[PDB]
């Protein structure tokens, strides 16, 4: 009775005074709140009242009465939890993490704890940034809603960067589709070196191997440029750059070139450029 009288009014100064002078009324008031799910303990049923609800912010009502009580650290924990369960709307998952991060940055965490929260958050921003960078050619081709839809994985990004639909695909699009190979998970299960070929083969299909007046036409200007972009001058970085292009295949490549029907066109300069790629390496 007294606990539902303290809940119909704006007196959580009374339910504090009730728990102040009691034997075990804390373990009762929480279990009385949960049984009364949507019946008693709501801050939306109550309109002094705000103060009472805030007491009523003890435990489960923290998201709203906790923001009101300026408990930023608590708001950050729930905002992140909501961001994780979020699957229905990409735009909302992005917003909740932003709010979570702003709540934590505006909270009173020690610099060490704050650094841990912003680092674990930086990981969440890192995965999301993949679905964020989806090309605006494919999102109109697949007829996808801009914000009212779901995100992406390195596999989806890699495959979308190299789609026939990505018409103006240049050195950067393929370079970033070879940067997205360390973001996989279970490399021997999902086929790393199959994709490593799929991309380097569409990296030649877009090139267009042609001939001008009976002479070889090196279309491999993008294949050329991508092999100029792998080396970051790691000779002076102390990395074993010498002998560090055996990522790419060779005899296994002309197997895929046969499937595309393009072996006769490009196999003259595929090997020719693979000679000044054994001198580069």
């Amino acid at each position: 009775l007294v606990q539902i009288c303290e809940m119909t009014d704006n007196q959580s100064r009374l339910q504090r005074y009730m728990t102040l002078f009691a034997e075990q009324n804390f373990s009762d008031f929480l279990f009385r709140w949960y049984l009364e799910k949507g019946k008693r303990g709501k801050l939306l049923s109550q309109p002094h009242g705000q103060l009472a609800a805030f007491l009523q912010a003890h435990d489960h009502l923290s998201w709203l009465h906790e923001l009101n009580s300026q408990e930023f650290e608590k708001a950050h924990r729930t905002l992140q939890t909501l961001a994780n369960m979020e699957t229905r709307y990409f735009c909302k998952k992005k917003t909740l993490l932003g709010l979570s991060k702003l709540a934590a940055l505006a909270s009173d965490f020690q610099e060490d704890v704050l650094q841990e929260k912003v680092e674990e958050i930086a990981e969440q921003e890192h995965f999301l940034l993949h679905q964020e960078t989806l090309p605006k050619k494919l999102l109109e081709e697949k007829q996808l809603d801009l914000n009212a839809m779901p995100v992406l994985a390195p596999f989806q990004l890699i495959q979308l960067y190299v789609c026939e639909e990505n018409k103006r695909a240049n050195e950067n699009d393929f370079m970033k589709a070879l940067d997205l190979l360390e973001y996989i998970g279970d490399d021997s299960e999902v086929d790393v070196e199959e994709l490593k070929l799929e991309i380097l083969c569409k990296a030649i299909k877009r090139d267009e191997w042609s001939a001008t007046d009976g002479k070889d036409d090196p279309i491999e200007a993008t294949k050329d440029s991508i092999f100029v972009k792998v080396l970051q001058n790691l000779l002076n970085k102390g990395i074993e750059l010498k002998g560090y292009l055996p990522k790419a295949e060779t005899l296994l490549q002309s197997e895929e070139l046969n499937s595309l029907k393009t072996n006769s066109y490009f196999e003259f300069s595929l090997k020719a450029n693979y000679e000044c790629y054994m001198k580069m390496q």
Binding site: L67, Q70, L99, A103, S107, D108
Partner: protein
Amino acid sequence: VSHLPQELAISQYAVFLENITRCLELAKEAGLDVKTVVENTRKKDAGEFAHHDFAPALDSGTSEEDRAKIDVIDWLVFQRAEALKQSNAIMRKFLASKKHEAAKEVFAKIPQDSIAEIYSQWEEQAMDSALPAEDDNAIREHLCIRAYLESHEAFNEWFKHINSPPQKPTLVGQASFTEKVAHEHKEKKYEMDFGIWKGHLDALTSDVKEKIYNVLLFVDGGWMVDVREDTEEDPERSHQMVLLRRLCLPMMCFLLHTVLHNTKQYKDCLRLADIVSSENQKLYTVFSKTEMRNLLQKLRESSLMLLDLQLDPLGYEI
């Protein structure tokens, strides 16, 4: 006087000063033919100390300095690089005290064409090569100051308009039949004016919002951030630039939140958390921990009004 070295500056001023308050100008130029920024800096230093006695508040000297910079800018517009650089320094002191009229009075003394004349080359890449690191930053700082100033101009107009809404028709209970008809007309006229005072407000809201975003999301490096990193050491300016960000970016975000909340744009209010936390701008580093929590309590207020409208906390449909 020019024959003798000591009178190289003073003689020109005295002959020049009497004449200024054309042919006289030409004569002055001839006399000169027969530095200024450094002298101004020295004067500023003297003002900052002024020997044994220094005024507790102001006065005039700060104002006097502002007048001098505007005068040189007009004179420079007619030393324009130095006039702009010194003008920025004077305005940086006034911005930290929020003397927007003082900053604007200096800003109009700068000729509107000063940016165009300072350049040594038409092509931008070749301009960068010749333009010193002091001058690239001073051009950018002046536009940053203008972007800030325009964001308080439009806000004060909008804030004046939000406090002039049409008042409801006064009710005459127990009305005569004459008073009933006059009231039916006054009621109908009010229902026109309240639509216009929303109409003018929506236009002032759109314009004030754009200016605030131009400051908060300032193109090419963030507001009051040098893009040119090869300048000589100036800790008085660089620490002023860091300070101006911490006094005015929290304030501008709070004003925007107030503008968005007042016009009922609650979904956009919550997207201030995306803007502030954003690794692209790093605006969260210019806030104190207290200011962050104070933003988070402001955002929760916007969220409540979204719940009252039947939506989720972030203004998406349930």
